[PDB]
Enzyme design. Structure first.
Site, PDB file in Angstrom:
ATOM      1  N   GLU A 236     -10.921   1.402 -10.965  1.00  0.00           N
ATOM      2  CA  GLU A 236     -11.578   0.120 -10.871  1.00  0.00           C
ATOM      3  C   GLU A 236     -12.012  -0.441 -12.204  1.00  0.00           C
ATOM      4  OE1 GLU A 236     -11.438  -0.136  -6.655  1.00  0.00           O
ATOM      5  OE2 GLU A 236     -11.888  -1.560  -8.277  1.00  0.00           O
TER       6      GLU A 236
ATOM      7  N   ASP B  96     -11.244 -10.086  -8.960  1.00  0.00           N
ATOM      8  CA  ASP B  96     -10.471  -8.906  -8.731  1.00  0.00           C
ATOM      9  C   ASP B  96      -8.974  -9.196  -8.576  1.00  0.00           C
ATOM     10  OD1 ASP B  96     -11.218  -7.992  -5.228  1.00  0.00           O
ATOM     11  OD2 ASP B  96     -10.145  -9.612  -6.116  1.00  0.00           O
TER      12      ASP B  96
ATOM     13  N   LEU C 166     -17.323  -5.681  -4.860  1.00  0.00           N
ATOM     14  CA  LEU C 166     -17.014  -7.030  -4.383  1.00  0.00           C
ATOM     15  C   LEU C 166     -18.276  -7.866  -4.117  1.00  0.00           C
ATOM     16  CD1 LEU C 166     -15.130  -9.164  -3.364  1.00  0.00           C
ATOM     17  CD2 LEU C 166     -15.404  -8.146  -1.142  1.00  0.00           C
TER      18      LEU C 166
ATOM     19  N   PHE D 290     -12.904   2.733  -0.199  1.00  0.00           N
ATOM     20  CA  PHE D 290     -13.652   1.987  -1.160  1.00  0.00           C
ATOM     21  C   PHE D 290     -12.909   0.660  -1.497  1.00  0.00           C
ATOM     22  CE2 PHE D 290     -16.723   2.081  -4.654  1.00  0.00           C
ATOM     23  CZ  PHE D 290     -16.178   1.140  -5.547  1.00  0.00           C
TER      24      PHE D 290
ATOM     25  N   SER E  85       0.204   6.882   9.183  1.00  0.00           N
ATOM     26  CA  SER E  85      -0.034   7.707   8.002  1.00  0.00           C
ATOM     27  C   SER E  85      -1.189   8.656   8.281  1.00  0.00           C
ATOM     28  CB  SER E  85      -0.511   6.926   6.780  1.00  0.00           C
ATOM     29  OG  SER E  85       0.358   5.883   6.464  1.00  0.00           O
TER      30      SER E  85
ATOM     31  N   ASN F 183       5.235   7.038   4.153  1.00  0.00           N
ATOM     32  CA  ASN F 183       4.767   6.018   5.056  1.00  0.00           C
ATOM     33  C   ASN F 183       3.684   5.131   4.396  1.00  0.00           C
ATOM     34  OD1 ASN F 183       2.576   5.231   7.472  1.00  0.00           O
ATOM     35  ND2 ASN F 183       4.754   5.167   8.094  1.00  0.00           N
TER      36      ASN F 183
END
Length: 164
Positions: free
Chosen positions: A11, A20, A32, A104, A117, A132
């Protein structure tokens, strides 16, 4: 390596409001602020989050505090989610980090949508699951990060990050 150092790599750290990869207003370590187009709506959310008038800027300490909250809330969200909890519990310590990273970035709801998945990870079919996971908007939009996470699930080691 741990979840914090992993997410810090993925990040980055920014002390001034920024947009972002999706164009949303964010600050700190991937925190965010709002999906709203208004920088003003973002500044307000920021001040609400820190408890001071920040004027769009925060300190290192403030960013780390937000980061601690967000990691905590991510883990707690997985633990409360009926779809996520069982996967998480079935995983080893490294792989748990990879799931937390997805949550996250994309929120509980988004990750819980990766039905197939999740089933493969639960079953420990590493290669099938990595393949996948790659068939997603997620992988197409942020391929370097997705690859790192995917490698983490495939191998169960921190190789993808030892580089970085």
């Amino acid at each position: 390596m741990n979840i914090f150092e992993m997410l810090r790599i993925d990040e980055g750290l920014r002390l001034k409001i920024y947009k972002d990869t999706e164009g949303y207003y964010t600050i700190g370590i991937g925190h965010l602020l709002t999906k709203s187009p208004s920088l003003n709506a973002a500044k307000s959310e920021l001040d609400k989050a820190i408890g001071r008038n920040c004027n769009g800027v925060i300190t290192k300490d403030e960013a780390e505090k937000l980061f601690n909250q967000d990691v905590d809330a991510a883990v707690r969200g997985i633990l409360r989610n009926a779809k996520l909890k069982p996967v998480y519990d079935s995983l080893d310590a490294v792989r748990r980090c990879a799931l937390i990273n997805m949550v996250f970035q994309m929120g509980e709801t988004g990750v819980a949508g990766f039905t197939n998945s999740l089933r493969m990870l639960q079953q420990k079919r590493w290669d099938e699951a990595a393949a996948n996971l790659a068939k997603s908007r997620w992988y197409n939009q942020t391929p370097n990060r997705a690859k790192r996470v995917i490698t983490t699930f495939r191998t169960g080691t921190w190789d993808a990050y030892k580089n970085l």
